[PDB]
Design a protein around this ligand. Structure first.
Ligand SMILES: Nc1ncnc2c1ncn2[C@@H]1O[C@H](COP(=O)(O)OP(=O)(O)O)[C@@H](O)[C@H]1O
Ligand SMILES: [Mg+2]
Lengths: 48, 153
């Protein structure tokens, strides 16, 4: 507790006492490039 | 649990065991690149081995152990001359032909083109010239004259 630092005992983590669910919303797309449409596929050609 | 098939090595160093349909099947057995490396297996190799049901998150049964490769024990796989390295020669073992339902055809073929082992032969005919029926006769005749020869059609 230096300037406005807060010191917490462990119990509030042992108890389900401060938590929330964070939701992440990713997104992608396939395009049809004049070089060739970008297939959404499972293939990683090279190695693994 | 036992499985069998023909080895098809993927680009990633692992392979699958296939059935007669010669394609990807749901029942193909995974073969790790490891087993391939120890047993020096190669594409088209016939592998028989005890397998297990695939684990959770596994889609294909896995070959726990290799028992026989090409109907023989795996050891010979490590030490054998590669097929590409085999010395080619002329067909030195004639295969004489006969099929009971048409011995005319087989005997004429023998009088026209005797067949040996290692033969690179061809029958040339327009459409509807018996080429298919002739091939049928040859299949039947080989399955009577040379049962020892693995007859693949
Ligand atoms: N040795 C034979 N005896 C009787 N019929 C034959 C014989 N060879 C060919 N044929 C007839 O010719 C047709 C074409 O023969 P096939 O070789 O099977 O087809 P294709 O030569 O067009 O591939 C068949 O319908 C068959 O009845
Ligand atoms: Mg035909």
């Amino acid at each position: 507790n230096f300037e406005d630092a807060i010191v917490i005992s462990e119990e509030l983590l042992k108890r389900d006492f401060y938590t929330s669910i964070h939701i992440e919303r990713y997104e992608i797309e396939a395009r049809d490039t004049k070089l060739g449409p970008e297939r959404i596929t499972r293939d990683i050609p090279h190695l693994s | 649990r036992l499985v069998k098939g023909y080895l098809e090595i993927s680009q990633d160093g692992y392979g699958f065991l296939t059935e007669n349909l010669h394609n990807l099947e749901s029942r193909v057995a995974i073969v790790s690149a490891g087993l391939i490396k120890q047993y020096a297996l190669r594409a088209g190799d016939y592998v028989v081995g005890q397998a297990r049901p695939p684990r959770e998150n596994e889609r294909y049964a896995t070959l726990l152990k290799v028992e026989a490769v090409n109907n023989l024990d795996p050891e010979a796989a490590k030490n054998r001359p590669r097929f590409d390295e085999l010395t080619p020669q002329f067909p030195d073992r004639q295969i004489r032909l006969e099929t009971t339902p048409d011995e005319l055809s087989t005997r004429v073929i023998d009088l026209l083109a005797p067949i040996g082992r290692g033969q690179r032969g061809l029958i040339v005919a327009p459409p509807k010239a018996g080429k298919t029926t002739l091939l049928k006769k040859i299949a039947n005749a080989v399955l009577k004259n040379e049962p020892d020869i693995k007859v693949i059609v």
